[PDB]
Write an enzyme that holds these catalytic residues in place. Structure first.
Site, PDB file in Angstrom:
ATOM      1  N   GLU A   1      48.660 -30.916 -20.731  1.00  0.00           N
ATOM      2  CA  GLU A   1      49.488 -30.939 -21.968  1.00  0.00           C
ATOM      3  C   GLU A   1      48.696 -31.579 -23.097  1.00  0.00           C
ATOM      4  O   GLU A   1      48.411 -30.947 -24.126  1.00  0.00           O
ATOM      5  CB  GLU A   1      50.814 -31.627 -21.680  1.00  0.00           C
ATOM      6  CG  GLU A   1      51.603 -30.808 -20.719  1.00  0.00           C
ATOM      7  CD  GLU A   1      53.066 -31.168 -20.743  1.00  0.00           C
ATOM      8  OE1 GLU A   1      53.436 -32.361 -20.628  1.00  0.00           O
ATOM      9  OE2 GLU A   1      53.867 -30.204 -20.967  1.00  0.00           O
TER      10      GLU A   1
ATOM     11  N   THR B   1      57.684 -34.199 -23.072  1.00  0.00           N
ATOM     12  CA  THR B   1      57.085 -32.879 -23.331  1.00  0.00           C
ATOM     13  C   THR B   1      58.002 -31.763 -22.875  1.00  0.00           C
ATOM     14  O   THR B   1      57.620 -30.584 -23.023  1.00  0.00           O
ATOM     15  CB  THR B   1      55.704 -32.760 -22.694  1.00  0.00           C
ATOM     16  OG1 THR B   1      55.881 -32.709 -21.295  1.00  0.00           O
ATOM     17  CG2 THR B   1      54.748 -33.826 -23.201  1.00  0.00           C
TER      18      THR B   1
ATOM     19  N   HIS C   1      55.355 -36.872 -11.996  1.00  0.00           N
ATOM     20  CA  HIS C   1      55.319 -35.405 -11.874  1.00  0.00           C
ATOM     21  C   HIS C   1      54.012 -34.927 -12.474  1.00  0.00           C
ATOM     22  O   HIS C   1      53.320 -35.681 -13.121  1.00  0.00           O
ATOM     23  CB  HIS C   1      56.525 -34.731 -12.537  1.00  0.00           C
ATOM     24  CG  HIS C   1      56.611 -35.043 -13.990  1.00  0.00           C
ATOM     25  ND1 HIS C   1      57.224 -36.155 -14.504  1.00  0.00           N
ATOM     26  CD2 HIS C   1      56.107 -34.414 -15.078  1.00  0.00           C
ATOM     27  CE1 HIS C   1      57.051 -36.201 -15.819  1.00  0.00           C
ATOM     28  NE2 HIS C   1      56.376 -35.114 -16.178  1.00  0.00           N
TER      29      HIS C   1
END
Ligand SMILES: O=C(O)c1ccccc1S
Ligand SMILES: [Zn+2]
Length: 258
Positions: free
Chosen positions: A104, A196, A92
């Protein structure tokens, strides 16, 4: 009032339902390149995707997952910091509303436009659900995306997104080769961390590649046309699905390269 990426349910709220959000090995982190230590003892990294079998693409309401058949050792990650064999289950992305944010992990506080997560589980634990309960359960290969030249190997992904616009939509997605998403170099940083996204489980060996891939502005624009909402609900563009950097605490980031 389920978790998300909005003002009232975003990353600053997650700790109320998921107290591990304030834990000792949360992800992502900023990678301070001058503090990361070269570790000459890291073994070479082995990414073996020749027999990968993609099945499906799913909009899960926070990202889209490209899912693989993980019922045999077809697409495996080995070597580097890892002990044993990790099987690819899905990939993803996380991305921004604008090209200047979306990753991120950060590199010396630099944000990339997006970040690809190739998720693998440790075969010694039998299945993904068991593996996420272990401190060495997952290995995630993180790859940065910058906007420039198109990535030809991404276009098959980009072109199916109109068919999974809203939460809970899936589409068949066979014969997709994830080798077309890898940069030339496998130089990486590694540290122990977490998912995350909720449930934020502390089960991940992160392997973050130094070399970004380039995608075109048109490719990432198609990511930003996705929706977080279901069909027939008010439209909320799926953008800024990233968690910001978390405290490093008692961790060391290791480099595979001098
Ligand atoms: O988004 C997730 O749920 C995830 C799952 C597996 C590995 C990494 C992540 S960040
Ligand atoms: Zn992720």
């Amino acid at each position: 009032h389920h978790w998300g990426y909005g003002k009232h349910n975003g990353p600053e709220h997650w700790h109320k339902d998921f107290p591990i959000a304030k834990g000792e090995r949360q992800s992502p982190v900023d990678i301070d390149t001058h503090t990361a230590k070269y570790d000459p003892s890291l073994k070479p990294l082995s990414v073996s995707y020749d027999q990968a079998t993609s099945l499906r693409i799913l909009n899960n309401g926070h990202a889209f997952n490209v899912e693989f058949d993980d019922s045999q050792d077809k697409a495996v990650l080995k070597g580097g910091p890892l002990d044993g064999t990790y099987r690819l289950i899905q990939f993803h992305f996380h991305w921004g509303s604008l090209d200047g944010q979306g990753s991120e992990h950060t590199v010396d506080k630099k944000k990339y436009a997006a970040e690809l997560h190739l998720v693998h589980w440790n075969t010694k634990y039998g299945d993904f659900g068991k593996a996420v309960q272990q401190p060495d359960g997952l290995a995630v290969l993180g790859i940065f995306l910058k906007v420039g030249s198109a990535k030809p190997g991404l276009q098959k992904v980009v072109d199916v997104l109109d068919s999974i616009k809203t939460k809970g939509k899936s589409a068949d997605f066979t014969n997709f080769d994830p080798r077309g998403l890898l940069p030339e170099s496998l130089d990486y940083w590694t540290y122990p961390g977490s998912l995350t996204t909720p449930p934020l489980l502390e089960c991940v060996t992160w392997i973050v590649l130094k070399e970004p891939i380039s995608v075109s502005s048109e490719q990432v624009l198609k990511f930003r046309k996705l929706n977080f909402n279901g069909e027939g609900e008010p439209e909320e563009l799926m953008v800024d699905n990233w968690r910001p950097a978390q405290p490093l605490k008692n961790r060391q980031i290791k480099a595979s390269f001098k």
